[PDB]
From Swiss-Prot, chains A, B:
Keywords: Calcium, Copper, Metal-binding, Repeat, Zinc. Ca(2+) 1 binds at residues 28, 33. The keyword Metal-binding applies. This is Protein S100-A5. SMART domains: EFh, S_100. GO terms for cellular component: neuronal cell body; nucleus. It comes from the Eukaryota. Ca(2+) 2 binds at residues 60, 62, 64, 66, 71. Homodimer. CDD domains: S-100. It holds the Pfam family S_100. One of its GO terms (molecular function) is calcium-dependent protein binding. Residues 12-47, 47-82 form the EF-hand domain.
Length: 92, 92
């Protein structure tokens, strides 16, 4: 038995490991694998090419242009804060 | 239109603001709000009291004994790496 939150974490592992196998290492999202993933995973219109390549420059820790899981946790942090800050303007 | 990952992050924001609202300040998980949240989010059974008291003490960068949102992303990081390391014994 496993929660809808363990299934949420599993989905984050799913789109990560699945798209992380598009290129580079199978544990990294290259700047192409990440651009591929964001362009499917975040549907909200402004996921445009310079929005993603400047985001990428801030998600990455070293400019290797391969996103390791601890680089990728920066993405997950900002997105989980942004949906909270949305909820603070909607449920009020 | 918003993805199953945005709905996974929404689930995380929903459990978060609910338990992060349940003691101390409302954007922050106290040693009790966290011990609640973990034992609600993780069905594992090794989410035991001293495992959680070390985990809390290991999450709490600042020793204030609430978990701010940027403390809480460290929990989500360890879990997204642990379910990947699970997935690496199956989808090898
Ligand atoms: Ca890759
Ligand atoms: Ca990198
Ligand atoms: Ca609190
Ligand atoms: Ca703290």
């Amino acid at each position: 038995m496993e929660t809808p939150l363990e299934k949420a974490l599993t989905t984050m592992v799913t789109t990560f490991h699945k798209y992380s196998g598009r290129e580079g290492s199978k544990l990294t999202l290259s700047r192409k694998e990440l651009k591929e993933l964001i362009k499917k995973e975040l549907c909200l219109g402004e996921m445009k090419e310079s929005s993603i390549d400047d985001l990428m420059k801030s998600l990455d820790k070293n400019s290797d242009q391969e996103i390791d899981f601890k680089e990728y946790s920066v993405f997950l942090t900002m997105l989980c804060m942004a949906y909270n800050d949305f909820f603070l303007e909607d449920n009020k």
